[PDB]
Design brief:
Protein name: RNA polymerase sigma factor RpoD
Number of helices: 4
Family: Belongs to the sigma-70 factor family. RpoD/SigA subfamily.
Subunit structure: Interacts transiently with the RNA polymerase catalytic core.
Number of strands: 0
Order of helices and strands: HHHH
Function: Sigma factors are initiation factors that promote the attachment of RNA polymerase to specific initiation sites and are then released. This sigma factor is the primary sigma factor during exponential growth.
Subcellular location: Cytoplasm
Amino acid sequence: QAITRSIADQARTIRIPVHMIETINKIVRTSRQMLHEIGREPTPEELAEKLAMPLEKVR
DNA sequence: CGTCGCGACTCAGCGACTCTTAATCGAAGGTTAACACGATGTTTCCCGCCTGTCAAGGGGCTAAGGGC
């Protein structure tokens, strides 16, 4: 928890927030699982509904 | 009358900064526990004060035409 709490801040050079880091990690994990099971890379508009979040927020 | 007890000695050894001078084209890949109030900003309208139209009215100044 401390590494994930600190890696999410002092790793991007811009100090991305912890919740945004976890959201982008969830997005990349969903994209990886889709590439592994479904097939080709999904569109960014599809990842918004794949995680049950706003379509504009994922963009 | 020898050496060794005890001292320096310089020799090796080990580390370490630059790669002329202008130029042939711009970006560049990964790492994947879950949730919760709280205090902290973010973003919309909504009136407050104020700013800017053109208009209406008018008068006052300027000037042009007519009469003696």
